[PDB]
Amino acid sequence: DPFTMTPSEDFVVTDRGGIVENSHRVHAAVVDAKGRLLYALGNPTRMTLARSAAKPAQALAILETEGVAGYGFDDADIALMCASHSSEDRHIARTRAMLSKIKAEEADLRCGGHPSLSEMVNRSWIKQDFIPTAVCSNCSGKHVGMLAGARAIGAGTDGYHLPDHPMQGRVKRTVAELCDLDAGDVEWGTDGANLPTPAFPLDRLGRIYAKLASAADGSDAGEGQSTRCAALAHIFRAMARHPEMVAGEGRYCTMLMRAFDGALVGKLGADASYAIGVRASDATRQLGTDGALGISVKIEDGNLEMLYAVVTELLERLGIGSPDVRSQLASFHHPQRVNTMGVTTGGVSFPFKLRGSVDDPRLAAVAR
Amino acid sequence: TPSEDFVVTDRGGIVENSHRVHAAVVDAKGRLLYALGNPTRMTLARSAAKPAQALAILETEGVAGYGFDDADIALMCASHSSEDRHIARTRAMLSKIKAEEADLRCGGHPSLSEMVNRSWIKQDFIPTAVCSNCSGKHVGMLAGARAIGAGTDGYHLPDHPMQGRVKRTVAELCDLDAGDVEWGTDGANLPTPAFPLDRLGRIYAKLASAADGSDAGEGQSTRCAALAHIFRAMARHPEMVAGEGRYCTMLMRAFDGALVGKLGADASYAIGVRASDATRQLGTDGALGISVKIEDGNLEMLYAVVTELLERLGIGSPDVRSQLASFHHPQRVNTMGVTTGGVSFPFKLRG
């Protein structure tokens, strides 16, 4: 029944010859630069672990640490602070170069190695029986930045990753401020790189990225900016200018940001969250706002392949990009379902319904 | 109305992911005894259908003369890890029917075992037909095609008499009309069935009930004798059904003949349990079947949920189920060795 559809029915579905295989619940928030909710799927205020999608906020805490500017980190270094990189040789090399800029060593890192986020890098490692180390961590740029901040303020570098260290105090305050939340409304766990990692309502992730894009708009327009806005604009520019540092070859975040050529930044969070900050455009004005826009997405069950398909579908429904721009992402939008003998067996579909654009006022949209 | 039954992962007590669970526990006639979620969800059984496909093979006139043994039949029932021993038995079965790898109509794929696949990657190995996790099923279907003098070139096609026999056998074991079983195509390019989840449990209840009847000396039909043989082969050679470290293998070794279990791709699972003190305590005088589907397809959550279900149902002892402890509560340890989270089962079995 099309007239009683509900957020609880916002799904992405795979089929085999039209027979339902798996279904996945979708949550999404589309917000303006003040965080006002414009469109939604599912529960747009779902309490959600932002995971690596919080990295631009952590990079802001690093860059706002007094004395860090003296080290001379460049745009590509800042993009690596914002990264879940593929541990390609260039990412490892830049990690070592950043360590040298602050006169630190690999032994000072408090993150550990892991199989590469890229299948192609991991195959190269498997062939050589290579055991990844701390400098290979996908979070290595963030950790070097945290070490840099600890050094700059005269804190111990031992324990820079611990919650009671001033660098983590700065991270926690900065995240809550960008979300416009009280501290008690942000919850904290520990991530794979052994750092505090925040959870907050999903729409506030979109809000962080709308603020990134809004700051970039203000910088480009030559507006006088606060130190924080200037730093957010710098983070946006660094990500857009060096998207290969943010992920790597063949990675969604990199291909997305290259396709859009400065129009937006995007960032993956582990267990299938995603965030995009969109500079003001004809597309954002058609969506009903006079400034920048933020988008955040969570697949409830954590499936990454479905995440990238949904994010690409959502950009199409929001009219962001062109068919030609979004077509660089076609392999993510409709994932291949080809069996071992080259026969297509099924596909992906998107039975979810954006709300916010309509319906009988008696139709309740219960966030679920 | 189906309950809202979930398995939930957390990071420091904060919800990470949640996964909807469907499950059916049925008696030997398929009557529903316990459920999670929607126990009749229309579900692609995928490889959990392989014992029914093995039955169609074993019931084919002339197949007995090839001399397939228990380990061969276990391989027909397998989603194996493509270990060297699985490939070697595939080749040995091809030799029994005087066929070649080129006669197979399945293709190679990365191993279901990450350890095997890493070993292949290190050695630049390109898997071929004989490495398919379904290779034993395909040899069996080739064997059946040969046995009745049908063409072998298209034994995998829907209009071939081997697939006619498979389709009829699946619906008969489900106790469904032909029109109530839907069909797609699987990764190995064979027809693969969808039917209500509880009927998958019914198939495995019939497997275990047949083993109970053969064990007790009852006048069994030929079909029941064949089902008992399939159960015996899987429980005797569980390493052929999956492989080292695989859930199905560790599950069946732990239970030492008390049950058989089988994975279906995209996170279905089926178990047939022979009558026991545990099944009698559950209120049935015969064998039992269990089938599970994780709605979003997550395998790690599947194995955690199945093990939690065995615990709720009292199936096995604590000591026996502790062999599956690593699947029941999967590791959540970061790159520096710190535990960051866990898994929870806020569902409740309804009876």
Author numbering:
A (entry chain A): -3 to 353, 357 to 367
B (entry chain B): 2 to 352
Anything the authors wrote about it?
Asparaginases (EC 3.5.1.1), which split L-asparagine to L-aspartate and ammonia, are grouped into three unrelated structural classes: Class 1 (bacterial-type), Class 2 (plant-type), and Class 3 (Rhizobium etli-type). ReAV is a homodimer with an α/β protomeric fold, formed by two tightly packed domains. The active site of the enzyme is located in a cleft on the protomer surface and marked by a zinc ion with an unusual coordination sphere created by Cys135, Lys138, Cys189, and a water molecule. The conspicuous catalytic center of the enzyme comprises two Ser-Lys tandems (Ser48-Lys51 and Ser80-Lys263), centered around the curiously hydrated Ser48 residue and located in the close vicinity of the metal binding site.
As in the structure with the C135A mutation, the absence of Cys189 triggered a collapse of the metal coordination site and the C189A mutant protein is unable to bind the Zn2+ cation, as also corroborated by microcalorimetric titration of this protein with zinc. The mutation induced slight atomic shifts and structural rearrangements in the active site area, but these changes are not strictly equivalent in the two subunits of the dimer. Alternative conformers of Cys135 were found in protein chain B, where the major rotamer with refined occupancy of 0.8 retained its typical conformation and points to the Nζ atom of Lys51, while the minor rotamer is rotated toward the Oγ atom of Ser133. The hydration pattern of Ser48 is similar as in the WT protein, with a water triad centered around the Ser48 hydroxyl group. However in subunit B, the Ser48 side chain exists in two conformational states, with the major rotamer, with refined occupancy of 0.7, directed toward the Ser80 hydroxyl group, and the lower-occupancy rotamer pointing to the carbonyl O atom of Leu264. The pattern of H-bonds at the two lysine residues, Lys51 and Lys263, is practically the same as in the WT protein. Only one conformer of Asp187 is visible in the electron density maps, but intriguingly, its side chain points to the main chain N atoms of Ala189, Asn190 and Leu191, and not toward the side chain of Arg47, as observed in the previously described C135A and H139A mutant structures. Apart from the interaction with Arg47, the sulfate ion forms H-bonds to the N atom of Gly188 and to four water molecules, two of which belong to the hydration sphere of Ser48. The position of the sulfate ion is slightly shifted compared to its position in the D187A mutant structure, where the sulfate ion is bound right next to the water from the metal coordination sphere. As in the case of the C135A and K138A variants lacking the metal cation, the mutation affected the oxidative state of Cys249, which is not oxidized.
